[PDB]
DNA sequence: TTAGTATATGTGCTGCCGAAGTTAGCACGCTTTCCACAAGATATATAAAGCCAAGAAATCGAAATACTTTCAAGTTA
């Protein structure tokens, strides 16, 4: 893995990690967040969505 | 034709600094576009309550006067 990933998904993951580190959440929280983000990205409706949509996806 | 001279001939010398390799015994431990597919942005009840900002009324806070008290100095005695 980490090779069949788009630049948009990579930016989303990096934003997730950045917000996690800003809120100072543990690495377990970081891992759970990235896992849930990947699980949500698996779907196509969220995959091909808006920029604000994917930002709110990071947030949620 | 022969002695003197210039060249390259490979050879052998010198340093040249660097090259590999060495050093003993346990326990712990980014950009352009380009691209195509599907997702904004759109009417429309629709009951429901909570929220977020103008107005209108209300009462709290208190300030400028109206009463009473109080002295203190002065009166009829």
Swiss-Prot record:
Induction trigger: Down-regulated by epigallocatechin gallate (EGCG) treatment.
Domain of life per record: Eukaryota
Subcellular location: Nucleus
Region entry Interaction with target DNA, spans: 48-54
Function, as annotated: General activator of RNA polymerase III transcription. Factor exclusively required for RNA polymerase III transcription of genes with promoter elements upstream of the initiation sites. Contributes to the regulation of gene expression; functions as activator in the absence of oxidative stress. Down-regulates expression of target genes in response to oxidative stress. Overexpression protects cells against apoptosis in response to oxidative stress.
Assembly behavior: Component of TFIIIB complexes. The TFIIIB complex has two activities, alpha and beta. The TFIIIB-alpha activity complex is composed of TBP, BDP1, and a complex containing both BRF2 and at least four stably associated proteins; this complex inhibits the transcription by pol III via its phosphorylation by CK2; YY1 facilitates the TFIIIB-alpha complex formation. Interacts with TBP; this interaction promotes recruitment of BRF2 to TATA box-containing promoters.
Family: Belongs to the TFIIB family.
Name of the molecule in the record: Transcription factor IIIB 50 kDa subunit
Organism of this sequence: Homo sapiens (Human)
Source taxonomy: Eukaryota, Metazoa, Chordata, Craniata, Vertebrata
Whole sequence portion shown: 61 to 120 of 419
């Amino acid at each position: 893995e980490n090779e069949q990933v788009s630049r948009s998904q990579q930016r989303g993951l990096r934003r997730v990690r950045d917000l996690c580190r800003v809120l100072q959440l543990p690495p377990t929280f970081e891992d759970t967040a990235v896992a849930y983000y990947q699980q949500a990205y698996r779907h196509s409706g969220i995959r091909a969505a808006r920029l604000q949509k994917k930002e709110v996806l990071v947030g949620c």
